[PDB]
């Protein structure tokens, strides 16, 4: 269906311990495919998916030169930003940047985004129209003016509607086996006594891709959204995901309860009875 490519840059200062730590990482949908680490002895943009390894040396040569340049701008940014908020020299600080593009079912450009953050909070963001900025805070307006003056939004838009989308489409073709195919969730229910009058019913979903999923519990067809405990959807490590949802049930009524799984891998939404 719809798809996305995104890059996540993270730089963190190391006061009195040398140069900042830069980590870049690249995703298509919920699948990572590249990364760069300034602390890695490699000193190269490395692959983290099979379907990108087939790209030529020009790609790896170039991507590396670019990612190095990215880190160096963020390095300066850490200094400028400390000045903008006027902080001491002791204490580590963090800059993050997230950008990329979305495509529809038709693989045509849908949305572009570009966000910056200082010490965990929104700093500046490019708006939907890819023409104007959102200088959240005060100091951010300084940056906003520089970036308006240097027409940054125009070259970003150019990238987001141009090479971003075009290369996402290319990646989707090269990685067809991985990226365009779904892994339906493997499901099961477990039972644990809380007391002698209460028991937990847990609904599981394992080995599923993509990470998007919905697990809900129902008592006699009616949704139990309030007493349900969800866990953060977590990675299996093999490229699939896991999630469970649980409810507390009165002992001897488990049979009234059903679990409803929703996912692209499933042709139709699964309904799981505790007692068939």
């Amino acid at each position: 269906g719809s798809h996305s490519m995104r890059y996540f840059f993270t730089s963190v200062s190391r006061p009195g311990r040398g140069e900042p730590r830069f980590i870049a990482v690249g995703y298509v949908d919920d699948t990572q495919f590249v990364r760069f680490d300034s602390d890695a002895a490699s000193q190269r943009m490395e692959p983290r998916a099979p379907w990108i390894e087939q790209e030529g040396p020009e790609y790896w040569d170039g991507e590396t030169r670019k990612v190095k340049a990215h880190s160096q701008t963020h390095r300066v940014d850490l200094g400028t930003l400390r000045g903008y908020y006027n902080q001491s020299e002791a204490g580590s600080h963090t800059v993050q940047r997230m950008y990329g593009c979305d495509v529809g079912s038709d693989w045509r450009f849908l949305r572009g985004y570009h966000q910056y953050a200082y010490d965990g909070k929104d700093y500046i963001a490019l708006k939907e129209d890819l023409r104007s900025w959102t200088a959240a805070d005060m100091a951010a307006q300084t940056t906003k003016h520089k970036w308006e003056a240097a027409h940054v939004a125009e070259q970003l838009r150019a990238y987001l509607e141009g090479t971003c989308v075009e290369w996402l489409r290319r990646y989707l073709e090269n990685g067809k086996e991985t990226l365009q195919r779904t892994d339906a969730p493997k499901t099961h229910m477990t039972h644990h006594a809380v007391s002698d009058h209460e028991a937990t019913l847990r609904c599981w979903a394992l080995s599923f891709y993509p990470a998007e999923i919905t697990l809900t519990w129902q008592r006699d067809g009616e949704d139990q959204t309030q007493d349900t405990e969800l866990v953060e959807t977590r990675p299996a490590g093999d490229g699939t995901f896991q999630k469970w949802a649980a409810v507390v049930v009165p002992s001897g009524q488990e049979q009234r309860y059903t679990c409803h799984v929703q996912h692209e891998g499933l042709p139709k939404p699964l309904t799981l009875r505790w007692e068939p």
Partner: protein
């Protein structure tokens, strides 16, 4: 502003005593990025534990997956030890076969 990590300890594939698996520790929703995550075999620290590359969620908070391969047993206690700037001292989460 800082954020304290959410820990989840689980296995890659459903646990079966004889069979081989991977022991996962998923720390997420934290800030700053610096974090110490160890995998513990019967209280002792497991040597050579790999991790995913540092990435972050829409809210800007970080996530990492620490993992090692292992063999489950009714005769070994596994856990994850996480320590962060937000935590006063290290926190230890036992691996429950089913959370």
């Amino acid at each position: 502003i800082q954020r304290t990590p959410k820990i989840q300890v689980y296995s890659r594939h459903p646990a079966e005593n004889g069979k081989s698996n991977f022991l996962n520790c998923y720390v997420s929703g934290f800030h700053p990025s610096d974090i110490e995550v160890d995998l513990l075999k019967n209280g002792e620290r497991i040597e050579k534990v790999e991790h995913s590359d540092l990435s972050f969620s829409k809210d800007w908070s970080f996530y990492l997956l620490y993992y090692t391969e292992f063999t489950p047993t009714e005769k070994d206690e596994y856990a994850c030890r996480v320590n962060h700037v937000t935590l006063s001292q290290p926190k230890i989460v036992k691996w429950d076969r089913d959370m």
